[PDB]
Amino acid sequence: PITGSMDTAYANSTQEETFLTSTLCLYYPTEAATEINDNSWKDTLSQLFLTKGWPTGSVYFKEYTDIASFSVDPQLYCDYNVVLMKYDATLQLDMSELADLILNEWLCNPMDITLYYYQQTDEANKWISMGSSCTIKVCPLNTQTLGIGCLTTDTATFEEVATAEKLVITDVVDGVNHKLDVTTATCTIRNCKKLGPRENVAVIQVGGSDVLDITADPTTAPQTERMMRINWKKWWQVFYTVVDYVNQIIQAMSK
Amino acid sequence: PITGSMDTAYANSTQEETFLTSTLCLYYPTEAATEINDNSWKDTLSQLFLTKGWPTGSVYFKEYTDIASFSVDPQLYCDYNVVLMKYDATLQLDMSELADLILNEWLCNPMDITLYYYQQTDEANKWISMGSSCTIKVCPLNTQTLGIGCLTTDTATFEEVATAEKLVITDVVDGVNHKLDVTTATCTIRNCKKLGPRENVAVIQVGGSDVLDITADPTTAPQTERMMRINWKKWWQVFYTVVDYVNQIIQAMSK
Amino acid sequence: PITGSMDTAYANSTQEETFLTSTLCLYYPTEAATEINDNSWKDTLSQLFLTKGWPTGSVYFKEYTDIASFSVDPQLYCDYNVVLMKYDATLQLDMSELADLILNEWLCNPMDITLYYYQQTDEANKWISMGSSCTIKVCPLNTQTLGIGCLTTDTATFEEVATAEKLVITDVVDGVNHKLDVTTATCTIRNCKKLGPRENVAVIQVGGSDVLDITADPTTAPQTERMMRINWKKWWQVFYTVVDYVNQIIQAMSK
Amino acid sequence: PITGSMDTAYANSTQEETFLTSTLCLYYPTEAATEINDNSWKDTLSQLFLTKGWPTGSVYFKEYTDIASFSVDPQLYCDYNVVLMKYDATLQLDMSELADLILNEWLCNPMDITLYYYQQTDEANKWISMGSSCTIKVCPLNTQTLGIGCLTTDTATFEEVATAEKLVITDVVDGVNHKLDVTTATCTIRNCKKLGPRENVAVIQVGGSDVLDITADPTTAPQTERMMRINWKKWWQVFYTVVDYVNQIIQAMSK
Numbered sequence A, B, C, D: 001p002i003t004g005s006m007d008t009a010y011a012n013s014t015q016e017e018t019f020l021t022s023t024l025c026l027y028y029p030t031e032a033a034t035e036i037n038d039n040s041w042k043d044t045l046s047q048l049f050l051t052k053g054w055p056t057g058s059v060y061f062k063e064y065t066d067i068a069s070f071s072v073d074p075q076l077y078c079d080y081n082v083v084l085m086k087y088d089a090t091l092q093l094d095m096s097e098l099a100d101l102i103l104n105e106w107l108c109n110p111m112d113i114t115l116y117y118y119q120q121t122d123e124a125n126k127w128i129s130m131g132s133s134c135t136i137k138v139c140p141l142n143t144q145t146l147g148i149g150c151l152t153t154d155t156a157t158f159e160e161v162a163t164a165e166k167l168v169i170t171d172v173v174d175g176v177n178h179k180l181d182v183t184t185a186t187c188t189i190r191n192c193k194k195l196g197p198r199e200n201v202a203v204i205q206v207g208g209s210d211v212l213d214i215t216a217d218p219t220t221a222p223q224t225e226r227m228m229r230i231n232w233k234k235w236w237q238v239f240y241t242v243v244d245y246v247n248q249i250i251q252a253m254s255k
């Protein structure tokens, strides 16, 4: 708690502290840069970024070459991250799972699939696994440690819920134990509790028509400010717009 | 009328009367079950349904193999019906016409295309025809029982508004008589007045991106709670979610 | 200013002045009419239009054969214009750029790409170019009239932002001068300031699923009443609906 | 702020919350374990750890095989980390640079050596680079972007400040721009701001005589509690002591 008195003073600007003290990291796909075909595009855009008010050493340009790799290896480097995603219609869920991770605040612990069969607790306990090739088979346990539609002994009776993905947020019926069978060789599966959203990313979507259903349930559909959309023409245009509206995009994030 | 006094008592639960006294019917497409590949999937899910609070003999599993057949033969068996529809982009309107029927409350009478040329009255009088192959040709009549752009005598001058569909909700300019030419051999066309919505279905949509325009007009777009959407991964996952959020889905329907 | 006193007397109707004094212009694509296959469809619909209250000589039918040509040559002829656009997924942005032009109120001046390098001023200053084949390459100037990632001398170093389009609304980082290189032979590029919206069109969209992002930025998404959507079945049905709901559609425009 | 009233109540124990809720991670070098020569040393010590009050699944044993690799790949896994370092006199600075990283709280951003010549701001802005082989050459710029004792064009005139290290905290004259030339192939260099110390590690030093100068300047010498020293005899003895005084060591860290 804060005291609630309406002094009523708004302290001027806000954008003049962020220009001085914060970093902006732009994530794009390879195809984006390839279409631009210049050895100095990162540089040209940077001078253009001074216009919008970001000092030379301020803006960074990170190249993901696919939504699957980016979804994994996506350690967000800067204060503000605005990631460019161009609609690929077959990869939609890949994209959804990646958005769900960046746009939100995640808390995870490690899981030992080998020794302890687990269970999710609430609408916020999910299993986020990611890596080379993630293949997850599951087997629900009744209150005896016995299978239900499966033999905890032969994984050929398990239920496959992911076949070789690069990022996967698995959801099982809450309050039920499950013997898990991941391909830990190429995958890593961790038990995460959700929450806090992200006051950074700003997934900007290129193409389609969208409406984005990023919930695991069917009941809710959340539309946040850190979820923007741009009409595709050419990649140079996309970047010009991102620059011409940096502050607007940053203002939709913060901290 | 009810008395409006704010006694202000909410009577506890609500979900503990529906668990005891109601039935839940899950409609899915063949492909859904085929991908699951287990002889006991209906059973496993049922035990999982006890968790969410539905007694053994409570939940039923109905298999439509196509949106066209389901759209016809779709006599809703249970108290609560939640129908799973997975995006098929060419069938969209087939899907729209089917949604329009389940999600809403319909009143129909039979039409004799042979002896009496009809007319729709308001934004709620529509002609819902369905069957093997529904092919409807129409001919608008001026106030003399004469064609307008057609000869009430030769159907080769009629205007075709449906070419072999499995479910069709036809709409004509309100307040105008029309000689109708349906292929009654394989089709049945009935005159329906709309209305009451449905406090049951809950069309859950798999895939795409959606926004759904289920009005006949251009002016309105209604988005109801009984119109949910899930992000596709695998079918086992879809069902796990439907189970993990049965009550949430049921609560969005009722009665 | 008007006086604000609540006399409170709504003057009756509104639709009975428009029926008498206004004109309605329907724009459709060739494919639309071709599917109808009648030499008297324009006529039949016209008699049907008397029902909804539009005197014989009132309604006009204009045929665009493509979104690209219509986007150019689209001088709106009548008081009320309702344009029918059927989803074509590869042409989306072509469609977006065309919508942005009809649905809005535009102010333009001519640009001489040859003698004066320009700059856009605010989120409302855009460069709308259109013609046979519009190909625009740009070169940002620093405060010296020198290129930034380009040589104002060789257009092989310019940045291409449009490759042969029929309608293009170009957006560059605000407050920066640019030497422009359009193919003026087949294109015309003009400097427009936006604004006033249109109290006429009513782009009615056939097919897809839509949500339409018609802003240049990423932050905003505006959804107006003059942006309607219809579920595709057959073209005859589309027109019947447009007629059966003319007033509803007109009421969503006006003046 | 907290209220400062001297209620004067100390709440008992402190160690009985840490025993229940926290994890202890012991880092040692390979040589340490090799000298122990038992397949069950990790296990024996664990039972011994119950004595000091740490439940079975509580303590973890991580093996760094060198100060250089550990310095890189040293993602601290547990709540409390106590790292064992045995004096190697040629690697002193390697050790100093590693201590400086664990014992302290670090904030970093990524640097693009290719496109932007940087500068450090205060006694707390340092360049921490680490990897396979880190070789950093520097070239100070006067206020013109011109070299000072170097040609920003030929790196053969640069000043080498690190020749193939595994962890390097580089320090340059504050407030001066520098064109940097790292061997990014095998190295990664990031711009870090220092600060917060670490309320965890507890570098325990084996051998020598020490006094440790972990500042970049010459003026200060900080000696913290999270910087302990043990007299070498045998490795088994070292671990016995670490166990016999776990709480004492933990108490010198916390949170």
Ligand SMILES: [Ca+2]
Residues within 6 Å of the ligand: A149, A150, A156, A157, A158, A159, B038
């Ligand atoms: Ca199975």
Ligand SMILES: [Ca+2]
Residues within 6 Å of the ligand: A120, A121, A122, A123, A124, A125, A171, A172, A173, A174, B244
């Ligand atoms: Ca769950």
Ligand SMILES: [Ca+2]
Residues within 6 Å of the ligand: B149, B150, B156, B157, B158, B159, C038
């Ligand atoms: Ca005809």
Ligand SMILES: [Ca+2]
Residues within 6 Å of the ligand: B120, B121, B122, B123, B124, B125, B171, B172, B173, B174, C244
């Ligand atoms: Ca009607």
Ligand SMILES: [Ca+2]
Residues within 6 Å of the ligand: A038, C149, C150, C156, C157, C158, C159
């Ligand atoms: Ca260029």
Ligand SMILES: [Ca+2]
Residues within 6 Å of the ligand: A244, C120, C121, C122, C123, C124, C125, C171, C172, C173, C174
């Ligand atoms: Ca602009």
Ligand SMILES: [Ca+2]
Residues within 6 Å of the ligand: D149, D150, D156, D157, D158, D159
């Ligand atoms: Ca030198």
Ligand SMILES: [Ca+2]
Residues within 6 Å of the ligand: D120, D121, D122, D123, D124, D125, D171, D172, D173, D174
């Ligand atoms: Ca310094």
